[PDB]
Amino acid sequence: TFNDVKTSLGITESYDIVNAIRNSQGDNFKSYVPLATANNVAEVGAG
Amino acid sequence: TFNDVKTSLGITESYDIVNAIRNSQGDNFKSYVPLATANNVAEVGAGILINQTVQNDFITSLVDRIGLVVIRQVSLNNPLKKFKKGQIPLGRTIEEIYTDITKEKQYDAEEAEQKVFEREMPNVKTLFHERNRQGFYHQTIQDDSLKTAFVSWGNFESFVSSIINAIYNSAEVDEYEYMKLLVDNYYSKGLFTTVKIDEPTSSTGALTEFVKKMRATARKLTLPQGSRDWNSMAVRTRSYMEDLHLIIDADLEAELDVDVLAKAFNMNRTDFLGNVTVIDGFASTGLEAVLVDKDWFMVYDNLHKMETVRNPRGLYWNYYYHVWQTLSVSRFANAVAFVSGDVPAVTQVIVSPNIAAVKQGGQQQFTAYVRATNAKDHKVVWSVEGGSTGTAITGDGLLSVSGNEDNQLTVKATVDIGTEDKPKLVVGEAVVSIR
Amino acid sequence: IIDADLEAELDVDVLAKAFNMNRTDFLGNVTVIDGFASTGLEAVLVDKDW
Amino acid sequence: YTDITKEKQYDAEEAEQKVFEREMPNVKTLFHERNRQGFYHQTIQDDSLK
Numbered sequence: 001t002f003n004d005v006k007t008s009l010g011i012t013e014s015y016d017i018v019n020a021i022r023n024s025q026g027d028n029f030k031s032y033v034p035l036a037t038a039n040n041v042a043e044v045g046a047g
Numbered sequence: 048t049f050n051d052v053k054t055s056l057g058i059t060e061s062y063d064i065v066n067a068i069r070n071s072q073g074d075n076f077k078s079y080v081p082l083a084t085a086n087n088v089a090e091v092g093a094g095i096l097i098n099q100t101v102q103n104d105f106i107t108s109l110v111d112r113i114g115l116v117v118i119r120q121v122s123l124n125n126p127l128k129k130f131k132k133g134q135i136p137l138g139r140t141i142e143e144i145y146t147d148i149t150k151e152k153q154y155d156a157e158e159a160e161q162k163v164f165e166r167e168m169p170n171v172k173t174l175f176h177e178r179n180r181q182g183f184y185h186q187t188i189q190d191d192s193l194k195t196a197f198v199s200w201g202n203f204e205s206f207v208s209s210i211i212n213a214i215y216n217s218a219e220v221d222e223y224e225y226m227k228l229l230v231d232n233y234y235s236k237g238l239f240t241t242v243k244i245d246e247p248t249s250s251t252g253a254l255t256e257f258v259k260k261m262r263a264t265a266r267k268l269t270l271p272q273g274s275r276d277w278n279s280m281a282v283r284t285r286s287y288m289e290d291l292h293l294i295i296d297a298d299l300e301a302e303l304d305v306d307v308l309a310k311a312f313n314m315n316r317t318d319f320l321g322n323v324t325v326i327d328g329f330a331s332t333g334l335e336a337v338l339v340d341k342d343w344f345m346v347y348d349n350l351h352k353m354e355t356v357r358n359p360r361g362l363y364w365n366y367y368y369h370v371w372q373t374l375s376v377s378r379f380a381n382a383v384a385f386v387s388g389d390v391p392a393v394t395q396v397i398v399s400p401n402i403a404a405v406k407q408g409g410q411q412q413f414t415a416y417v418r419a420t421n422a423k424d425h426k427v428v429w430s431v432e433g434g435s436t437g438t439a440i441t442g443d444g445l446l447s448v449s450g451n452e453d454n455q456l457t458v459k460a461t462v463d464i465g466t467e468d469k470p471k472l473v474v475g476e477a478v479v480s481i482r
Numbered sequence: 483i484i485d486a487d488l489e490a491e492l493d494v495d496v497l498a499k500a501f502n503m504n505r506t507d508f509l510g511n512v513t514v515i516d517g518f519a520s521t522g523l524e525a526v527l528v529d530k531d532w
Numbered sequence: 533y534t535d536i537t538k539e540k541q542y543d544a545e546e547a548e549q550k551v552f553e554r555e556m557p558n559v560k561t562l563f564h565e566r567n568r569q570g571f572y573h574q575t576i577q578d579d580s581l582k
Contacts, residue, residue: 255494255495258490258494259487259490259491259494259495260490261490262490262493262494263486263487263489263490263491264486266486266489266490266514267486267516267517270486270514270515270516272516274516276516307498310499311498311499312498312499312500312501313497313498313500313503316493316494316497316498317493317494317498
């Protein structure tokens with residue numbers, strides 16, 4: 001029983017992909033903007 | 048997906064048994080010291096509200112897994128279901144008819160000359176009942192979303208079936224609560240005949256005093272001459288003994304069998320006459336027991352359909368279960384009320400024609416039946432509202448009608464209970480046609 | 483001629499918790515009515531020729 | 533365990549908009565875990581008991 005676990009636990013976020021899609025004015029991440037559930041695949045997608 | 052939650056969520060602790068075991072040192076918890084794993088049982092053993100992924104003891108990276116899933120299927124029935132009359136396919140209203148006894152006339156061979164051919168109408172009271180309850184039970188099953196909670200199809204089919212039964216359990220429970228409402232509708236309108244008692248819980252004498260009034264009343268319903276005393280339409284009706292139903296709660300049956308029928312040598316002399324129906328309770332203040340005929344209820348079914356629909360977008364079914372029925376009460380049947388509170392001195396005044404058609408210029412006799420709960424005088428005062436010029440009801444209720452009356456009349460009879468400062472009238476009314 | 487108040491009170495208070503029914507029963511043929519329209523009159527003994 | 537529901541009044545004026553309304557079942561769960569985990573120990577020297 002560990003009871004205070006966050007999803008990160010080892011992660012040095014190099015650039016925070018959640019804000020990176022949310023700020024895309026037409027750069028590289030503008031292909032990740034018409035995805036619906038991109039926030040959820042980004043949240044737990046690394047296992 | 049919660050947080051730091053505890054195994055102590057919904058627990059108002061009494062005394063910390065873990066402390067009380069180890070610091071017994073003489074107390075009666077010293078049967079628990081040789082139990083080795085007692086702290087583990089005394090922490091989880093109540094049941095955990097919120098599941099936590101417990102790590103394995105040997106290899107901590109493994110998660111301890113759900114080994115058996117238990118679905119607790121239960122059934123709720125209706126106690127008062129046996130009082131249900133039948134069902135109605137077509138038509139809304141039910142008409143009851145009761146013919147009543149009539150008036151003696153003196154012999155007179157002098158007046159019988161021209162009056163061979165005079166006519167008397169029979170004293171017939173009727174009564175009507177409409178469909179009342181019109182309702183449905185609705186709950187959704189999102190079939191594809193609950194596949195995550197179930198690793199098996201057995202636990203998937205038993206759980207979805209348990210959502211079906213919670214609709215049919217909502218039938219038998221909510222229908223039970225309307226028949227507790229018809230009792231508390233009838234008592235709230237003053238249509239039960241109130242038999243004022245004391246509370247049976249306080250004295251065993253007040254329990255046996257209560258058994259006296261019920262067995263007194265259950266014989267008065269069953270005399271072969273009837274009475275006008277126990278209807279709210281005041282007709283001569285005899286209840287048969289086997290149709291009397293007593294609707295005590297559960298507390299008074301335990302007082303009965305332990306304070307009285309335990310120690311009585313003869314149970315046939317202190318039981319409850321008629322039939323005993325044990326329920327939750329009564330919403331009214333002090334309405335402790337109720338005795339009725341079996342034909343007091345006019346409960347009839349109308350409609351029982353299960354209707355289904357599917358949302359393709361959100362991937363769910365909605366189950367609609369429509370329960371329509373006529374829920375009503377015969378006022379032509381005997382029904383009493385064993386009320387332990389302070390009751391009013393008069394509950395109900397009944398006028399013996401509720402429906403009269405008086406020819407313009409003709410006369411009609413009107414008749415109070417004051418349901419005094421005490422044994423006092425309770426003067427009845429008569430009046431006619433809506434009358435144009437004269438129309439003059441007087442005395443015992445002999446109605447007059449003028450030659451120029453065309454209006455519909457309301458004939459009132461009233462009784463003044465309590466003090467004149469706060470008058471609090473009790474009024475019975477009649478409806479008079481004019482031709 | 484027993485008013486139904488007194489019949490129930492004979493059964494509850496007296497003929498129950500008693501081992502001998504013939505030793506407390508009301509002497510005579512008991513006929514039960516709903517009560518007399520009078521004041522305080524409860525029961526009535528009469529002969530058959532009354 | 534799955535609990536009973538609430539009744540709704542028949543009305544075809546509100547049945548126009550709410551055919552796909554979503555009303556949630558009242559399911560409650562408990563969880564019971566393994567709690568007792570212990571052993572009993574008893575030695576027998578056969579030959580010196582002879």
